[PDB]
Structure formats: structure tokens, C-alpha cells
């Protein structure tokens, strides 16, 4: 239980849950939303306030989640940081990278914690593998396959699905992309519905990343290979399996609330000057990588 004044801006499908976690782990001041009925019922559920403006809310909190539509993340975030408040921004960070850089600089001049909601970083398998001190992997092979749900249009498979494994690749390798080839297939829209990236980093690591949003049977698999070790991560069987040149160690992992852990980490970074689980600089790096992937795809697709 952290002692901090917290609020959420944007309480839709995902901001409502942010609000709930804040209410359980902090003193949630209240919420703001452009839809007023929706903010009203969120505030009724959590015995908190539905503030009548962004600035009413901001004058009364130390920290907020920004869970507004992506195109708005820069605008809202400026007002929040301008007001001296800490921000956890839900993924994706921003639309283009100059917005991202602006926000990083604001946070740096104002000594505010800027966090990006790249949730897989708090997954227990990713924590286990990082504490294992295995080094940078040689080969990464991810597939993220989703059912097409009725709101899945304008959801670009790269900025929505693939970005999770792009982020993981940057994190576990610590390297930046130097070559990016990609294929895409636009089936329903002209936007990509299936995209697969073959990506090479300056440390010579290869990541082979496949996302597809028009899929019938979901799947969140990632296989990571060092020289003498191999992990398979199954994010929805929630299993982690490590093999040593074979020996098959099944790591059993505690299930835990991923968003709760994310928010606890954001607040704990504010409170103790800890590095947060994913700062704005990392969010910018993954945003640039996904933009590369998309440029390569729209090259392929023409």
C-alpha cells in the first residue's frame, strides 16, 4: 500500500482497470474522461471523484495513468507534465517519435517519472530469464496471434501486436536494429493483418517476429536461444521451459496481476527514485523499431 495521490485520465475498457488497481494500492483521487457518463459510473464503482476537467484532477494528484486513445497521448501528457505530475502512458507510447522525444525531454527537465505500459516486461517468465544472467540471445522467434474481434480494424498488427515482442527483443539483447526485412499481407483493410519481420541488431542477433490479427486460434509464443541455453515462453499457457545442452527444466511461475505489478512498479519508482520498469526512452526505442518494420512492410505490400 503506497501513500500517493493517483488518478486516471481516460477510463474506458483499460483505464477502468488502471483505476481499480490504483484504488486497491494507493489513494485514488478520481478520474477524468471526455465521456461524462462513463467517468461517472467508474467513480461510483470506486468511491472516488469524476473530476470535471483534466486540470481539476491534475491539481490533486501526484501520479496518473494516461489511457486515452493513442493519437491523444502527447496532448494529455503535456498537460500532465506541465502540471508537475508523473505519468504511466499505456502502449503504444505516441504516434511518431518526435512527440516521444518532446515528452522524454519534458520529463527530464521536470524530474518526473515517465513510464510506458509495456506490460510483458513484468511477466514472471521475462523476470526469471533476466535474473538468470544468460547474456544477449543469438536468436529470437516470436509469434503473437489474435482473434479478430469486432473492434480490431485500424488496429495495425505492427503497432498493436508485434510491438510487444519488439520491446522484448530490444530489452533482452540491449541492441538496436540495423537491418529490417519484412513481409506483410493486408487482407480485410489495406492495413496489415499479418506481418512478419526478420530483424538484425548490431550485436548480430536475429529476431524473427510474426503477428497476425485475423487468426482463429490465439497464440503467444516466444523461443529465445543463446549459445548454450534455449527458453520457450508460452504467455497463455503461462509456462517457461529452459533447456541446457538436453535437460528440460520446467520453471514454475507465480501467476500475478500484470497490471497491478505494472502500477506498483510505477508508483515504487516515483517513491524510491528507482528506475521504472520501462521508461520513456525505451518506449521511444521500441516505437522507432516498429516504425521501421512498418516501412519495410509497406515497401513489401507496395
Curated annotation (Swiss-Prot):
Keywords carried by this UniProt record: Lipid A biosynthesis, Lipid biosynthesis, Lipid metabolism, NAD, Oxidoreductase
Asked if the Swiss-Prot or TrEMBL record annotates the protein with the keyword NAD, the reply is yes
One biological process term in Gene Ontology: lipid A biosynthetic process
Looking up SUPFAM superfamilies in the UniProt record yields: Glyceraldehyde-3-phosphate dehydrogenase-like, C-terminal domain, NAD(P)-binding Rossmann-fold domains
From the UniProt record, list the reaction(s) this protein catalyses. Answer: UDP-N-acetyl-alpha-D-glucosamine + NAD(+) = UDP-2-acetamido-3-dehydro-2-deoxy-alpha-D-glucopyranose + NADH + H(+)
EC no. given is 1.1.1.374
GO function term, MF aspect, one: nucleotide binding
Q: Is Cytoplasm set as a keyword in this record?
A: no
A Pfam short name: GFO_IDH_MocA
Cellular component, GO annotation: membrane
What pathway is this protein said to act in by its record?
Answer: Bacterial outer membrane biogenesis; LPS lipid A biosynthesis
User: Where are the coiled-coil regions?
Assistant: none
Q: What class of enzyme is it?
A: oxidoreductase
InterPro entries reported in the protein's UniProt record: Gfo/Idh/MocA-like_OxRdtase_N (IPR000683), Gfo/Idh/MocA_Oxidoreductases (IPR051450), GFO_IDH_MocA-like_dom (IPR055170), NAD(P)-bd_dom_sf (IPR036291)
Residues binding NAD(+) are 13-14, 38
Disulfide-bonded cysteine pairs: these are none
- What family is this protein classified in? Belongs to the Gfo/Idh/MocA family.
Q: What does this protein do?
A: Oxidoreductase involved in the synthesis of 2,3-diamino-2,3-dideoxy-D-glucopyranose (GlcN3N), which is a component of lipid A in some species. Catalyzes the NAD(+)-dependent oxidation of the glucosamine 3-position of UDP-N-acetyl-glucosamine (UDP-GlcNAc) to a ketone moiety, forming UDP-2-acetamido-3-dehydro-2-deoxy-alpha-D-glucopyranose (UDP-3-oxo-GlcNAc). Is specific for UDP-GlcNAc, no activity is observed with UDP-glucose (UDP-Glc), UDP-glucoronic acid (UDP-GlcA), UDP-galactose (UDP-Gal) and UDP-N-acetylgalactosamine (UDP-GalNAc). Cannot use FAD(+) and NADP(+).
Q: How does the record describe its quaternary structure?
A: Exists in multiple oligomeric states.
What's the record's remark on domains?
A: Structural data in combination with molecular dynamics simulation and mutational analysis suggest that Lys-91 or His-164 is likely the catalytic base that deprotonates the 3''-OH group for the oxidation reaction.
The molecule here is called UDP-N-acetylglucosamine 3-dehydrogenase
User: What gene does the UniProt entry assign to this protein?
Assistant: gnnA
Amino acid at each position: 500500500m503506497i501513500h500517493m495521490r493517483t488518478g486516471v485520465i481516460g477510463v474506458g475498457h483499460l483505464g477502468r482497470f488502471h483505476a481499480q488497481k490504483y484504488a486497491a494500492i494507493s489513494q485514488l483521487a478520481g478520474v477524468f474522461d471526455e465521456n461524462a457518463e462513463r467517468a461517472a459510473e467508474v467513480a461510483a464503482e470506486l468511491r472516488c471523484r469524476a473530476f470535471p476537467s483534466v486540470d481539476a484532477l491534475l491539481a490533486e494528484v501526484d501520479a496518473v495513468s494516461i489511457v486515452t486513445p493513442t493519437s491523444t497521448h502527447f496532448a494529455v501528457a503535456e498537460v500532465a507534465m506541465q502540471a508537475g505530475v508523473h505519468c504511466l502512458i499505456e502502449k503504444p507510447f505516441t504516434l511518431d517519435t518526435e512527440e516521444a522525444d518532446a515528452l522524454i525531454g519534458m520529463a527530464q527537465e521536470r524530474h518526473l517519472v515517465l513510464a510506458i505500459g509495456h506490460i510483458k516486461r513484468v511477466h514472471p517468465a521475462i523476470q526469471y530469464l533476466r535474473q538468470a544472467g544468460f547474456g544477449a540471445p543469438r536468436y529470437l522467434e516470436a509469434e503473437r496471434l489474435a482473434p479478430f474481434k469486432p473492434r480490431s480494424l485500424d488496429i495495425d498488427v505492427i503497432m498493436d501486436l508485434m510491438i510487444h515482442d519488439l520491446d522484448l527483443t530490444l530489452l533482452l539483447t540491449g541492441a538496436e536494429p540495423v537491418d529490417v526485412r519484412a513481409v506483410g499481407v493486408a487482407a480485410v483493410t489495406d492495413k496489415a493483418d499479418m506481418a512478419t519481420a526478420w530483424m538484425t541488431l548490431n550485436n548480430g542477433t536475429v529476431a524473427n517476429l510474426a503477428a497476425s490479427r485475423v487468426v482463429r486460434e490465439p497464440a503467444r509464443r516466444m523461443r529465445i536461444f543463446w549459445q548454450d541455453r534455449y527458453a520457450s515462453v508460452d504467455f497463455l499457457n503461462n509456462t517457461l521451459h529452459i533447456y541446457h545442452r538436453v535437460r528440460d527444466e520446467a520453471v514454475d511461475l507465480a501467476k500475478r496481476d500484470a497490471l497491478a505489478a505494472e502500477i506498483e512498479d510505477f508508483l515504487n519508482a516515483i517513491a524510491a527514485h528507482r528506475p521504472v520498469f520501462c521508461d520513456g526512452v525505451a518506449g521511444r526505442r521500441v516505437l522507432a523499431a516498429a516504425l521501421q518494420v512498418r516501412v519495410a512492410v509497406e515497401a513489401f505490400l507496395q
